[PDB]
């Protein structure tokens, strides 16, 4: 299938309490592989997956210096954006960026992206063409114009088509036994009483990688998406994921409901019911 290299970066001011906190977290398909955090005892880029330990000290020193440079850059940005928005120096504010690329199974670029947010709202973003920017407001129009004079977009484009994709392939190769694996979901059903002669059936899926999964409830063959509680798929602390979907059904009728679990790790979708 396709794969992706993604960085989530945040800088958040805290007036009165020193310099902004700056964080970079990197992912290859749903697994955390690197991290920078300005509040660490010693702020350096560090591995977050065992396969990255193979990268030598030149990798770690380069990425560390890049991250410290990015930190100062975002510190300036925070000051700048107080000016654009006519805001005071006493409040805390947040810049977020998502930056990365996806390649298809042939190892070629499918899409690149770089989007920024300020205080939780769209700010500026590179378009799919990798040539122009969409500014969400007029503060961001100032940025758009600065970035257009500086050739920022072809600079970014060159990273996305060049460095980003080339490092993704490297990571997928060096970490293939972790990244290219599939852990199949193991599933079960729990049962809970409700008032009014009804019952919650909850279908659980545990232990799976990658994160993409689909849980449905059925009755005769109709999917009951119209009466389903669920949680977003979530990490379980060891590089695998979990999910549940529930449905409310009449007491004594729970044997006609089936949970179905769809995952790329499974040779065929799982089917199960409540076990009394």
């Amino acid at each position: 299938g396709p794969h992706s290299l993604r960085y989530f970066v945040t800088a958040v001011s805290r007036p009165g309490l020193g310099e902004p906190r700056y964080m970079e977290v990197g992912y290859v398909d749903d697994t955390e592989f690197v991290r920078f955090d300005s509040d660490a005892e010693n702020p350096r880029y560090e591995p977050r997956a065992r396969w990255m330990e193979q990268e030598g000290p030149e990798y770690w020193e380069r990425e560390t210096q890049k991250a410290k440079g990015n930190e100062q850059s975002f510190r300036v940005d925070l000051r700048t954006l107080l000016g654009y928005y006519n805001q005071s120096k006493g409040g805390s504010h947040t810049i977020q960026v998502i930056s990365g690329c996806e390649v298809g199974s042939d190892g070629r670029l499918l899409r690149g992206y770089q989007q920024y947010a300020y205080d939780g709202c769209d700010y500026i973003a590179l378009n799919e063409d990798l040539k122009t920017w969409t500014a969400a407001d007029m503060a961001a129009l100032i940025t758009k114009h600065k970035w257009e004079q500086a050739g920022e977009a072809e600079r970014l484009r060159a990273y996305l088509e060049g460095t980003c994709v080339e490092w993704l392939r490297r990571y997928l190769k060096n970490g293939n036994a972790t990244l290219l694996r599939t852990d199949s979901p193991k599933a079960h059903v729990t049962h809970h009483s409700r008032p009014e002669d009804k019952v919650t059936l909850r279908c659980w899926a545990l232990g799976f990688y990658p994160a993409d999964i689909t849980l449905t409830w059925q009755l005769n063959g109709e999917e009951l998406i119209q009466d389903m509680e669920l949680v977003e798929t979530r990490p379980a602390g060891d590089g695998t994921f979990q999910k549940w979907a529930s449905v409310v059904v009449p007491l004594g009728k729970e044997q006609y409901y089936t949970c179905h679990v769809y995952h790329q790790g499974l040779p065929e979708p799982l089917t199960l019911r409540w076990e009394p």
């Binding site: 989530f8 958040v12 947040t94 977020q96 947010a117 709202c121 909850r202 979530r234």
Partner: protein, 99 residues
């Protein structure tokens, strides 16, 4: 924007007494990013707690995982207490073994 954290508590494996496991507290859909997450065993702070899987969704709200190794016991109570600007007081979510 202000967004209240959704707090979810769960083990990696179905919980069996005497059997090593991982307790998780996923704290999601929140803004602004400043947050305090404490995992508790019998009302007391668990000292060895790894933070991980920090990210954000399409709408920019923050997600992060707190997790720790543990061995369940019938009598032990586990929970996760979160302080965030969106909430006047700390919200605790308790681990529900039977969920």
């Amino acid at each position: 924007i202000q967004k209240t954290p959704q707090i979810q508590v769960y083990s990696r494996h179905p919980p069996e007494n005497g059997k090593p496991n991982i307790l998780n507290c996923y704290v999601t859909q929140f803004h602004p990013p400043h947050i305090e997450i404490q995992m508790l065993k019998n009302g007391k702070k668990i000292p060895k707690v790894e933070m991980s899987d920090m990210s954000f969704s399409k709408d920019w709200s923050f997600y992060i995982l707190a997790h720790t190794e543990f061995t369940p016991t019938e009598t032990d109570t586990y929970a996760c207490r979160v302080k965030h600007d969106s909430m006047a007081e700390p919200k605790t979510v308790y681990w529900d073994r039977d969920m």
